[PDB]
Amino acid sequence: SMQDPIADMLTRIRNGQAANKAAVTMPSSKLKVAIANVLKEEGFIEDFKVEGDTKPELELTLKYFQGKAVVESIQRVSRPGLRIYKRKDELPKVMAGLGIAVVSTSKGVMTDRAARQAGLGGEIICYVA
Amino acid sequence: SGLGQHTTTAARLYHFPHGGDVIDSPGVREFGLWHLEPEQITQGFVEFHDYLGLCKYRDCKHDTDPGCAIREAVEEGKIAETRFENYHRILESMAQVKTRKNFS
Amino acid sequence: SLSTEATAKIVSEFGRDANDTGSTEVQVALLTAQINHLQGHFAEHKKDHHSRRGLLRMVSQRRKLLDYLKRKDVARYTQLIERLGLRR
Amino acid sequence: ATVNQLVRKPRARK
RNA sequence: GGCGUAAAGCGCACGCAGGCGGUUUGUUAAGUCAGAUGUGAAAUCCCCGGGCUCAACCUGGGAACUGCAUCUGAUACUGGCAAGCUUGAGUCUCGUAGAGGGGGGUAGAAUUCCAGGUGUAGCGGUGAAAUGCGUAGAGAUCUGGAGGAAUACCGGUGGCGAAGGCGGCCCCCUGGACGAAGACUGACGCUCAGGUGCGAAAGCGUGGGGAGCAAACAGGAUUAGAUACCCUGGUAGUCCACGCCGUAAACGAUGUCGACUUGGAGGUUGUGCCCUUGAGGCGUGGCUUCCGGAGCUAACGCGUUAAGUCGACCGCCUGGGGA
RNA sequence: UUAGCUAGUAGGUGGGGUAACGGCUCACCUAGGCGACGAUCCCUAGCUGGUCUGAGAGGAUGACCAGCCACACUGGAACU
Numbered sequence: 001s002m003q004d005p006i007a008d009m010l011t012r013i014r015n016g017q018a019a020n021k022a023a024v025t026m027p028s029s030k031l032k033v034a035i036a037n038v039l040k041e042e043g044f045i046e047d048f049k050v051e052g053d054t055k056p057e058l059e060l061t062l063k064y065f066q067g068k069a070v071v072e073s074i075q076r077v078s079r080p081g082l083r084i085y086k087r088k089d090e091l092p093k094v095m096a097g098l099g100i101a102v103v104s105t106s107k108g109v110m111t112d113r114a115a116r117q118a119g120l121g122g123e124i125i126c127y128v129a
Numbered sequence: 130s131g132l133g134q135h136t137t138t139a140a141r142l143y144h145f146p147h148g149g150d151v152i153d154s155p156g157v158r159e160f161g162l163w164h165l166e167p168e169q170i171t172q173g174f175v176e177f178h179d180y181l182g183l184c185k186y187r188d189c190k191h192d193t194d195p196g197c198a199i200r201e202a203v204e205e206g207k208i209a210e211t212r213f214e215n216y217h218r219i220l221e222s223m224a225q226v227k228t229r230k231n232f233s
Numbered sequence: 234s235l236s237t238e239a240t241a242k243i244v245s246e247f248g249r250d251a252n253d254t255g256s257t258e259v260q261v262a263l264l265t266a267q268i269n270h271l272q273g274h275f276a277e278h279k280k281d282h283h284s285r286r287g288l289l290r291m292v293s294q295r296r297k298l299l300d301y302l303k304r305k306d307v308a309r310y311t312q313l314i315e316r317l318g319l320r321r
Numbered sequence: 322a323t324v325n326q327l328v329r330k331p332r333a334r335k
Numbered sequence: 336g337g338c339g340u341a342a343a344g345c346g347c348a349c350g351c352a353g354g355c356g357g358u359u360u361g362u363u364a365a366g367u368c369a370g371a372u373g374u375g376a377a378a379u380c381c382c383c384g385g386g387c388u389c390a391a392c393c394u395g396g397g398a399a400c401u402g403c404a405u406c407u408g409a410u411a412c413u414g415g416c417a418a419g420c421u422u423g424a425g426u427c428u429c430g431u432a433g434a435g436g437g438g439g440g441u442a443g444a445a446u447u448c449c450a451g452g453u454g455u456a457g458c459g460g461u462g463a464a465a466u467g468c469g470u471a472g473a474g475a476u477c478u479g480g481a482g483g484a485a486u487a488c489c490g491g492u493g494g495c496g497a498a499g500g501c502g503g504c505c506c507c508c509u510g511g512a513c514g515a516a517g518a519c520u521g522a523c524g525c526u527c528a529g530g531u532g533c534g535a536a537a538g539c540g541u542g543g544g545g546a547g548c549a550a551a552c553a554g555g556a557u558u559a560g561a562u563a564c565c566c567u568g569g570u571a572g573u574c575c576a577c578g579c580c581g582u583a584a585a586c587g588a589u590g591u592c593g594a595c596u597u598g599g600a601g602g603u604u605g606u607g608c609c610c611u612u613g614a615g616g617c618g619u620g621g622c623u624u625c626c627g628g629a630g631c632u633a634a635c636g637c638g639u640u641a642a643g644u645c646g647a648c649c650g651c652c653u654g655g656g657g658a
Numbered sequence: 659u660u661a662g663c664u665a666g667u668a669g670g671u672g673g674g675g676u677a678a679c680g681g682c683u684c685a686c687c688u689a690g691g692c693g694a695c696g697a698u699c700c701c702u703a704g705c706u707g708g709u710c711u712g713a714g715a716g717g718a719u720g721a722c723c724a725g726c727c728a729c730a731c732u733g734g735a736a737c738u
């Protein structure tokens with residue numbers, strides 16, 4: 001079903017980015033806000049808005065270069081069938097340090113570049129390539 | 130039920146108590162007539178040697194041709210009609226075996 | 234399943250009001266009376282394996298609904314199992 | 322292909 | 336790493352255990368993460384050296400040994416507890432469509448049998464013949480009666496059912512699917528090893544039934560032989576009850592569920608609004624076929640019903656033959 | 659193509675026993691115990707630090723060195 005809504009979130013981003021869609025909407029949650037707000041601060045997307053309180057609806061503004069996909073590919077890493085965890089020195093890089101890896105720790109959701117100054121490890125969410 | 134079975138193989142050699150050898154044969158139901166012309170079919174029967182050159186024409190199919198002296202010998206009774214009707218069955222078999230092609 | 238007089242009565246029997254029709258205890262009673270309605274049917278019609286699929290669906294549906302009240306509040310669970318004649 | 326399938330029985334080495 | 340056609344998705348369904356799980360808050364700190372302690376014998380390997388004239392070799396210290404245990408921390412995610420919430424999954428009403436299944440009647444053609452009437456030399460069959468049938472009158476036609484099984488047209492990539500499958504009409508019992516308006520419970524869910532049930536036809540057991548068709552078999556042609564083809568007959572079987580057997584090219588050769596991603600030609604089934612100004616106009620759900628963009632694929636092709644991009648779970652394959 | 663195994667077996671009492679706890683042993687009492695997270699049965703095998711292979715993850719193996727266990731013709735027993 002919708003057992004991995006983060007994988008459902010990454011499905012809706014990769015489709016609309018490739019099919020030249022201007023903006024998408026999706027059901028919101030606390031975890032989907034904490035990931036899209038990081039992608040807004042890392043130049044991958046443009047803006048996010050929330051709509052509705054009894055039915056929380058998250059919106060994302062897409063981003064293009066000259067009509068080209070900014071987010072070329074994104075890869076869900078951990079999953080409910082197999083959980084993935086790393087330490088503070090085993091955090092993997094994406095495209096040898098070009099792409100970022102979204103890792104949620106006890107100090108909130110940050111990147112692997114931001115986790116070096118934080119010195120923590122935890123759950124890998126997605127490889128933002 | 131009403132047929133025969135070929136159990137023994139191709140040929141096994143032995144000797145007579147007097148002299149000579151024996152050669153067994155398979156159960157064979159085959160007829161290979163791809164060898165030569167139908168002129169040699171006329172030579173394949175003994176009593177039909179003495180009746181050649183007696184018909185009307187110098188070439189004769191001996192089935193639908195008028196004045197066949199070989200057919201007159203069958204109608205007289207010196208040649209049995211079982212051999213004559215089987216003779217043109219050989220010729221009509223060559224109209225059915227030859228169809229696709231075969232050559233050595 | 235049943236008629237309108239048989240449906241609306243049992244909702245008023247086990248529900249708090251006329252609007253109490255979506256709760257789990259009402260849904261058990263809709264399946265309990267229906268299986269009790271089909272006792273004499275499948276005895277005479279043992280070659281009807283297609284209606285038996287609808288029967289075994291409601292048996293599996295009622296078993297899943299009894300497991301929800303049992304894991305949450307056993308006080309209402311022990312009331313309904315003897316009020317309808319369950320647990321065999 | 323499923324990891325949870327290989328929990329019951331691993332890949333059979335010939 | 337694969338499972339439409341190269342080897343591979345169980346014939347299908349239910350469902351326990353197992354795995355997995357919407358959303359909001361609090362708590363626990365289990366999992367995970369941070370730090371510290373103890374420990375992980377030496378040797379081997381690695382780093383910098385030293386030494387044997389060199390190298391192999393020996394050897395100093397460090398690193399490593401990604402391990403385990405305990406303590407102190409952090410709480411985003413996962414787990415547990417607690418309170419919920421409603422879009423998931425369900426419930427009620429009003430409805431609509433349908434060969435969904437089971438049971439009990441009934442209809443009229445057609446086939447064969449039988450009775451009667453009129454009527455005469457062939458009927459029948461094939462490429463051509465023959466077996467067979469008929470002057471006890473066949474065949475053909477008409478009247479009357481019996482029995483058996485199947486339902487022309489409608490009828491269509493049409494509908495329904497989990498699948499195999501399901502078709503005269505009518506009644507009785509009963510199953511699901513879908514649409515509209517709201518009300519209501521509050522994750523009640525997905526999935527499935529064993530287990531459980533259904534499951535084309537043939538065949539088997541018991542007892543009935545018997546038209547037509549038809550293994551074995553009878554007869555006639557065909558033929559080198561005819562065993563098959565073709566023709567005239569014909570038992571088992573096909574029919575029903577009661578069991579058993581559980582295999583198919585049981586195929587969409589695609590396991591189930593959910594989420595999104597340009598679209599047309601249609602079909603079927605509803606619903607909402609509209610000079611009702613026509614069975615129309617405009618939308619909008621359920622089911623289904625043919626094309627086709629991006630994309631994917633070995634090609635063929637698939638392409639909003641995916642074989643596109645993903646997640647949840649399960650089955651199965653590892654050269655051909657042996658098998 | 660191993661699914662049920664087990665009566666000193668599982669637990670308790672008391673006595674006895676060993677350097678030490680203990681069905682270790684005995685009488686009695688209870689009917690449990692183990693097990694689809696592989697009990698039990700069959701076959702094979704000393705194990706580990708390691709070595710070798712491999713980019714790594716893995717794979718194969720346990721000679722020489724070192725640690726431990728077991729064995730000393732076969733089987734059984736106790737003394738010191």
Ligand SMILES: Nc1nc2c(ncn2[C@@H]2O[C@H](COP(=O)(O)OP(=O)(O)NP(=O)(O)O)[C@@H](O)[C@H]2O)c(=O)[nH]1
Nearest residue numbers: 133134135136137138139140153154155156157158
């Ligand atoms: N009554 C009878 N039976 C005979 C006679 N000759 C042979 N038979 C039988 O006929 C059968 C056939 O004999 P066989 O010689 O085997 O035939 P074949 O031609 O050799 N057969 P194949 O083609 O296999 O070689 C045998 O059973 C034999 O006993 C005879 O004169 N009288």
Ligand SMILES: [Mg+2]
Nearest residue numbers: 234235510511
């Ligand atoms: Mg109904």
Ligand SMILES: [Mg+2]
Nearest residue numbers: 336337341653
């Ligand atoms: Mg391959």
Ligand SMILES: [Mg+2]
Nearest residue numbers: 340341342343
């Ligand atoms: Mg194949």
Ligand SMILES: [Mg+2]
Nearest residue numbers: 346347498585
């Ligand atoms: Mg199938």
Ligand SMILES: [Mg+2]
Nearest residue numbers: 376377378707
């Ligand atoms: Mg050491």
Ligand SMILES: [Mg+2]
Nearest residue numbers: 377378395396
């Ligand atoms: Mg050292």
Ligand SMILES: [Mg+2]
Nearest residue numbers: 378379380394
């Ligand atoms: Mg060293």
Ligand SMILES: [Mg+2]
Nearest residue numbers: 386388389390
């Ligand atoms: Mg030197």
Ligand SMILES: [Mg+2]
Nearest residue numbers: 412413414415
């Ligand atoms: Mg939680």
Ligand SMILES: [Mg+2]
Nearest residue numbers: 444445446447
């Ligand atoms: Mg009739």
Ligand SMILES: [Mg+2]
Nearest residue numbers: 420519520521
């Ligand atoms: Mg409420």
Ligand SMILES: [Mg+2]
Nearest residue numbers: 538539540571
């Ligand atoms: Mg029999």
Ligand SMILES: [Mg+2]
Nearest residue numbers: 563564565566
């Ligand atoms: Mg025949």
Ligand SMILES: [Mg+2]
Nearest residue numbers: 539540571572
């Ligand atoms: Mg029978």
Ligand SMILES: [Mg+2]
Nearest residue numbers: 346582583585
């Ligand atoms: Mg099969």
